[PDB]
């Protein structure tokens, strides 16, 4: 409603571009670097330090170190996805649990209709109607990372008062093979 729109007025629209050097080798980044798909099996890519080698993750190219920013992700009719923000300084090699304590502030969908935070423990989110487009808001100085349905402005989750000192990236994760990609709205 009017509340989420005038919120949007106070946050700078970020132009998020996926970074192919960060993407786990099971992921494909599109030619326009706005969408991500999965491959049936891993591609042959370098194990460069930037790359997630266990988690099925990819980062934006640009990080945030101050200010208020937002971007929007077309999740569409996908059955599975997770999105949010992570530290520049997360562990990219080997497994770490994707939780706030490890520098991941994410939420998403599993099995078509189970929305959750990747808080520790996870928290189940009851969304009266499924989002097609998710708005992600970052306020670096307050420490808030929030998720909204970008069409009706309805709130999905906020991580409040996080203690940020680090650069933060947009992060995206997909586990499934589906016909619909995960796509950044410009």
From Swiss-Prot:
Domain B30.2/SPRY residues, every copy: 2-186
What is known about its subunit structure? Homodimer.
Q: Where in the cell is it found?
A: Cell membrane
What organism is the protein native to? Homo sapiens
The job of this chain, per UniProt, is described as: Plays a role in T-cell activation and in the adaptive immune response. Regulates the proliferation of activated T-cells. Regulates the release of cytokines and IFNG by activated T-cells. Mediates the response of T-cells toward infected and transformed cells that are characterized by high levels of phosphorylated metabolites, such as isopentenyl pyrophosphate.
Family assignment from sequence similarity: Belongs to the immunoglobulin superfamily. BTN/MOG family.
Range within the parent protein: 328 to 512 of 513
Q: Hey, what tissues is this thing expressed in?
A: Detected on T-cells, natural killer cells, dendritic cells and macrophages (at protein level). Ubiquitous. Highly expressed in heart, pancreas and lung, Moderately expressed in placenta, liver and muscle.
UniProt topological domain (Cytoplasmic) ranges: 2-186
This protein is called what? Butyrophilin subfamily 3 member A1
């Amino acid at each position: 409603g009017a509340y989420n729109e005038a919120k949007k007025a106070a946050f700078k629209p970020a132009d998020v571009i996926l970074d192919p050097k960060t993407a786990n080798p099971i992921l494909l980044v599109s030619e326009d670097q706005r969408s991500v798909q999965r491959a049936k099996e891993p591609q042959d890519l370098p194990d460069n330090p930037e790359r997630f080698n266990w988690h099925y993750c990819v980062l934006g190219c640009e990080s945030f170190i101050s200010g208020r920013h937002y971007w929007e992700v077309e999740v569409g009719d996908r059955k599975e996805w997770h999105i949010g923000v992570c530290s520049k300084n997360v562990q990219r090699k080997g497994w770490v649990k994707m939780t706030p304590e490890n520098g991941f502030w994410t939420m998403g969908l599993t099995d078509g209709n189970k929305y959750r935070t990747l808080t520790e423990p996870r928290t189940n989110l009851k969304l009266p109607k499924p989002p097609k487009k998710v708005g992600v808001f970052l306020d670096y100085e307050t420490g808030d990372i929030s998720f909204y349905n970008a069409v009706d402005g309805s709130h999905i989750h906020t991580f409040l008062d996080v203690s940020f000192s680090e650069a933060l990236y947009p992060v995206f994760r997909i586990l499934t093979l589906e016909p619909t990609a995960l796509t950044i709205c410009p």
